[model samples]
Target chain A: MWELEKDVYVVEVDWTPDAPGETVNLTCDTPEEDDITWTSDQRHGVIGSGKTLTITVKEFLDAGQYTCHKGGETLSHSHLLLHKKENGIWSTEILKNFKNKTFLKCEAPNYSGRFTCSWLVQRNMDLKFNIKSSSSSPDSRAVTCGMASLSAEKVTLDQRDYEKYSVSCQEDVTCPTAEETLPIELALEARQQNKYENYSTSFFIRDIIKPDPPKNLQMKPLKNSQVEVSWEYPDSWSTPHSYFSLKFFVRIQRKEEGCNQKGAFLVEKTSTEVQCKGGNVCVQAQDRYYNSSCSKWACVPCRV
Target chain B: MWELEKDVYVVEVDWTPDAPGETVNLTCDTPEEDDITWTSDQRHGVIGSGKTLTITVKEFLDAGQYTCHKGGETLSHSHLLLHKKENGIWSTEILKNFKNKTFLKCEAPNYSGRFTCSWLVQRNMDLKFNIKSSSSSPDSRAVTCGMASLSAEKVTLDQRDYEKYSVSCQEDVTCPTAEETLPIELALEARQQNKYENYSTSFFIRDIIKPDPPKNLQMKPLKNSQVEVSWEYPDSWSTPHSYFSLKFFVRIQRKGCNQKGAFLVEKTSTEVQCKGGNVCVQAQDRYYNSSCSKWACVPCRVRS
Candidate 1:
């Protein structure tokens, strides 16, 4: 005797066999006692005639809509979804191929709680992903991820291709003004065709802060063989310029007699006049309060 | 005398001087005749005392809010925006720096009308972009572009950084089912601080169709030293499999006695059987209706 698990969904019923090769019993309800005929979408015509039908569960062959007919009318229909067990693991060949594979790549471009994760797969596999975040602190905030509404496209990097399925995630609490945030432990569960696999990653938003480069970098010719270099802040940086100020690193390179002479300076203001002999000027910036990587250099030519 | 163009915006008015060094006149209205005093946000204290004042337009010094007052009661205010003409061109130092620079990069990843254009700049310049498209055909459809609602983030590729400001664009007509589409002549106008610049590019959506690779690529061992390789279509490709079918190219490589032996096949079905001695199998697909580049190969290992 086998006990099958049943799940009812409006007009159709789902039957899941507990184990492989177990017999599943399906019953049809009718008002009057009459002759019953059985049919399945997976198989051709009428397979049997009965009010109650019992069949052994096979692999994919036994999964489909099974219908019961009385005279000219249909009584009830049920869809069979078989979960085959291989070596005590409930998985299919397709799901088994994805096992132990790194199929998710995520990134947090700034200190903001919003981040994006991409599904790195080449196939058209229908799957649902559940993301959850945790921390060691008792009052840590909750973070959830939702699938982004963009058409799935492929990106090629260095001749390698990836199917980009991105999802956006946000935290419940504001992160920019927080004094300090606990490290987030992120976990993802990928459910594909009734089988699932789990993957995990961890990060601190502060550690992953990569700001855009400084803006409006320009150089003006000045007297005494000096050039005035100025630049504004990047657009993506945090607000209140007085509180979230940036320190800039300026570099000047001059080509004299087939040789390159370089000069470097670290400054706080947006503008600076420096001694130069007609060359190229570049500037980079970093956060004043946090220890993060410097932005990429914005450069302009100078002629003094 | 200067001919100043006036533009009113709610409570404040904007005055644009037609030429540099031209004298502009300002006036204030009051119910009763009273002595009027003029004050400017650019300079300290009251600059003039009159119901009507006249001044010559200078460079940056004359660009600010000019407020008129009558006995401590404010009457009206207007902002003067100077457009300095240098060598017969109305531009500023900031806008001039971006004059001939390539700052917009656009790409169409598929045959669909939707595409993305990125602003390649490192600064926080406040600018607005207008996009329009045209074609040579008499009944050609109209296309428009709008800025995408996503945070501007920096992406580094091969040590070079770019500030990614992307916009999504679409056409009015459907593209997939049409037999042919006219080439789209796209134009972009960039307006920054009252100054403008134009950039143009052209493309045909069919020429840029880059589909994702085939999915579910797997290899199953068969008898007589043969392996069966099969795969499904990509998710991003157009539906109605029979109408939008794909032709595949399969390749097999085997290592025998420290030497690599390769076999290739151009097939129509999703599954193919080939004689191999334990090797790697890969498959790529191309659209059956259009002549475009094939997708990237999806590979799987096999043991026969």
Candidate 2:
């Protein structure tokens, strides 16, 4: 049979505009003109006469012409066609979730670019972090209502052993870039799980790996049911963190396999602590435990 | 056909003695007249005088008896068996070479302990971590040899983000507990090499992944030959590592497409720092156009 004498360029089913990471719909119109009366009646699908000619959105490359009635005889007249243009706004997605947190990110530009994103602020933002080691970095948030600022505590720093944090928090500004970082030399880092990486820090001070509490550090008494001992703090890095330095307390007993009897108790510390007021002696204690069994104390008189 | 003459026990020429590993030889001796002569040869053909048998050492159990051949006319004559209890001491074999710089560790009790392992004073008595982690975590070193003290310069304390650490190390002493956990807080841990589990510091510290240089942190000309940049280290936690932080820097150069050129100058700091000490000068440089370029410096003089 002679091929249906039909216009391949007219009424060809195709596309219009395409969105990246998104989908769109196109209605193929016949004759490819703004209006074509007769081109809509024949079956090969046309959009000109309000006839629905549907085309599911695909990749950007599928944006050209196609003839619908190419080899058809009865409805050879109507053919659908379309072209495409770029049109897409990014929708957010959670790229990764780890360390009790979810990292939301969007890829754009097709090539590497400064991908900016932020979350809606509903709570006080307590954030920090470092980047190179990051699968995703933070972008400033410029919102409709207001912006957030890092409290004095939110400054960035160098790498450290603990949860090194670096954050870029902003609120309410449409353009997140305007949000300025606290001008402090800081950095953040950490593996996704609770185990983190060496965060950026000053002076490259190594993180301290403290020893277990001195084994069976004891506080017992002598013959009079009261005993005394002294303990000294190991020369460790700057006070075990801050606030409270070290703590010590006394109780009377024996735990060694052979030390089955109740020990006589003696109480003493050159200085007693707030935890041990009344008759207890005093000692210089900090937040962390010095792990000393013997805090210098006066002798006690008691019996097992 | 009567086999009444054969004894229940027969002795081979070689003997195995001492521990399983020891080796000993058998010596066959004949006291005076004997038809069955004590001999090293598989089957003593003849007990002719003067040749007492000696076998160089090896492992087969030597069993059998020596016989007196006074009336021997044909085969071996009457024999006296050697007792099993009197087997000679197995000789010692020399091992080729013991491992060098082998490390062993001993821990007192808990995961944390005060332990020091002093090895044989070899060329380097100090333990060398046969296995290791190159990351900043301290791996190999003598435990308790006075410790390396560390501290932070500009750390802002956040009690909520505090962390804990364990000192670990390795040495030649065998640790009673987990090799990774050296004794008594000695900064050493252990590992198994050739099936020998020794303690070593294999201390794994939390990490802080550094942030990538704020990419394409744009630099703009606030003035002639100068660039003013307002980039920020990310304010979003690359990780929950809140305690960590980072510092940042910006480099400026004349724009060159498809190639990154050397920075005319670099400024590093927590906040924005301008090179040539002038924000206005930087703006001018970034905005330079031969005719409209202004070298005039206004305010925000970095020197001040």
Candidate 3:
């Protein structure tokens, strides 16, 4: 690993003066052949004039991950990990306290110049992780802890083994890269506002809970014709248990199908029916009559 | 570094599958004991009858930070680490291709005999991050590439991170009396069940572009006539012009208060209001027509 001359590579990090103008980029991940991207446009607490590939950013980038070479093995240089500028603002709560914890802190803009920051953690839609940093300006960098969300997907959080979680926080200046998320404006406006309630009547009743039911209930291709069964109210509105909900119609039968039917059946025909009767239909039928039905059976036929 | 086994001693692990249920309750960390109790009932996976310290489950369990005396002088014993479970059913999706990559086969049916099992990874509300298999059973644990909704923090395509996912093919041969949650019928489900349609329906606008029109809008503390207008956003939202839906209004005017009606207007809206009649509303309207006609401009319009 030896390069004659013109292989100037260096990056310094120790930021947290509330983190200021922390800009940095040293290039040369090898394989550029006759490489010559030197240091075009550098800014990080300044000190570049040239010293045989110049090396002096906080007495050599705080001591870790640095390179600049020229060998016979056609080596590849990589110091391209320079990025930072998510000064702060990334917590719209997601079972937060960081669930298993992950260090976080935001609030920036005390500009001294040079900043690249990077982060992106949207988990529910796209991108699950990404974190980048670099420093040389912007008040020497501050606003410690953690924020690495740009997701390239190597995601981790339940820590017990890889145990690596270095999230830190503490903000000072830097409030001007256009206000960098203005102190989380009401927590991203309470996750993008709109708890709206102006309903004189536009309508709203969407759903109350009816997606997790069909568990372990057996009897598939046993296709036994006695399947004329029926069902109702998987959740016709209070919460997870809306309108006094209750679900269980299990049916295992077929340990050989001797037929006495299996367990939990209670539709008991219509077990205490529910009231109905507004503009779109009719009603009055308790004492076990009118059971609810959204309809979409398949086996049908039960008129005996 | 020396113990003659009056009861037990020997600290420092070298890997344990079971060397006495992973032995640990026999302490000795010097300082001569403040508390330490475990009469018996520690026979966890009982390979060689290792953990049999019982009182019900181990009398008063507290001398637990590492201790187990026998020989004296700077003594240090009981360095345990046990994790056992193996009752039945273990095939955590060994997919060659759900599309690209996936596999996480878990199995166990006999740490030696009557046992139990659990391996979960269901996120997005139901939120379970449990995966156990330290017991008595079968044998088939191959968690390769595996990508069945790693909590769908991301999976790609249409930028989809959360659509629907489930994986809990549990079992408990017979441990804490008996714990069950398994393929009693179908062996777990939920793969691309496709969700994110309404997501609590308060705000969500698809592909409607136009973000990044507000940054460092400053105007703070010019008092006696108001001036707090903050801003900042753009630290890599994929930083290629980071997808936006634009809607920012901060027009300031205060070389000494005067954007017409003593100046005081604001807007940063976007809870999603398209398809005609867009008005995400950014109102903090103390605009009682500009708060009492600018009582000294009330801290730059109540500081951003």
Candidate 4:
């Protein structure tokens, strides 16, 4: 069993290297009088006398497992973790979709769903988080992802023998009571074992609870080349209407076969004017909590 | 059951006199005995022999309880309730103490756990309302105050016949979760029984919940002649401090037995300055929703 004191010692993992005298004794737990020989599969030399062995630590130079061998009969073994050193703060970035970052960020996203996660660690560390609801006592679970940025509004997830990863857990564990704010108590952690600094955050799903997209959207014609759009409040917004500050984006394009004339407007009002005699219009709504999951575009014939 | 539509016809309990010819039938349903005669206990004539009787309706001129009797046996009875048409808005007036009119009021005061209430009505109407809490059920459990303005800051009730009243209930019901604002669902209603136009309002107790009075109030000595007054955040203000915009009222006075020369200062800072050598200082907290009960004045030892 490998146990390390929390916040006490900064350990290195993966591949690493250090010259003689420039390193310290890794461990000497083995019997001092044992007929043991030093050996390791890592890219380094392991010097040993009796039950002790000294291994130098380096980045990618002294990484891998080290073991004590008596004529090929393994007596003891340990993993030498080596980590890369980097400078920057480790932060959690919430992505609305696989692409395009959302500006309306919150402490936590909704539970009951898996989101694309990326670890922006300033140190040589990987991400490891334990997602727990307010009510639960389940064994911890772990998942991993690649180092990639959410860079587009939409992306294709076409796969064919393309390495795939899917995590399954007790439904009760992930699905919390649909909340006004998020569950009042939720914990998520990111870390790389004991080698790198780990980060943890407490949040409520309600904080990330997004309002439903606007519905019954339409554009009314004004005297000028403008249209008055309207829509009903989202049916799923349980929070008091007074608490919601919705933002709607209106996109208008000319219907003429060769006309590219169009207009885009963002306002708190339901409708906006776009210079158009007769064209198609679409509208989307963003709630205060979540912004990327805007309502699907609803286009209708317009007069002005 | 007197089945009456909500806010409908108003029925009078006392007898009344109407047009000389206009009369109403008041029945003494005693077995229809020929010897049973109905006589008026009120100052009015009851005509008709047998088990039936007819009476005239006037204003208060003919209002009172009437009983019927055979030669020597009591037969039946009835009481006429009289009510005058009163016109005015039915609103709530909260009083701080039992004394000179207290314009500064609230729903729940944190003093000796009681607030004075009065019913303000126009017209020749004498309607009495028993200020009550949900904790107490039934009519006997009510506290009555006055009909006119709640005047006098310090009104004394002599002991003995001086009845005292206090209501305690499951805090959750009468005392809603101490919210930052009153719940929008909370309703304020004003309606007559089977008559009059009724009204309803939406509000929350949190709206009237004043943060706990500023705590840890103290005096700090600055340069010559100037002393800094300070206070920490109210112990129970769960709302974000940013939203507080707290304004404090500071009163400083000398310890002269009858001296009322208390200089006043108001500011948002946790600490401010006031001119004083040895004096008593008290602080009051005022926020958007409520003005807290002032802290008891503490005498300072003049830390010059």
C-alpha displacement of B105 in model 2, angstroms? 8.8
Off by over 4 Å in 1: A1-304, B1-102, B109-112, B125-140, B150-153, B156-159, B179-182, B185-196, B219-229, B239-299
By lDDT rank, best first, the candidates go 1, 4, 2, 3
lDDT of 4 by residue, A49-119 (tens): 45666655544344445667765566666654333333333323321122233212232222333333222
Best by lDDT: 1
Best by TM-score: 4
Per-residue lDDT of model 1, residues B35-140, tens digit only: 8899988877989988777876655566556888987978887766554455555343332222245455555544457767665544447655566674436666
Q: Give the least accurate 10-residue stretch of model 2 chain B, judged by summed lDDT.
A: B283-292
Give the per-residue lDDT digits (tens) of candidate 3, residues B199-237.
Answer: 000100111112222343334444343333444442211
Q: Please tell me the TM-score of chain A for candidate 1.
A: 0.54
Off by over 4 Å in 4: A1-154, A158-304, B1-25, B29-41, B44-52, B70-76, B86-106, B110-117, B120-247, B251-301
In model 4, what lDDT does residue B17 have?
31
Order the candidate numbers by TM-score, best to worst.
4, 1, 3, 2
Give the lowest summed-lDDT range of ten residues in model 2 chain A. Answer: A202-211
Per-model TM-score, in order, reads: 0.33, 0.17, 0.18, 0.35
Fnat for the candidates in order = 0.00, 0.00, 0.00, 0.00
Report lDDT (CA) for all predictions: 0.58, 0.27, 0.26, 0.42
Interface RMSD of 4: 10.3
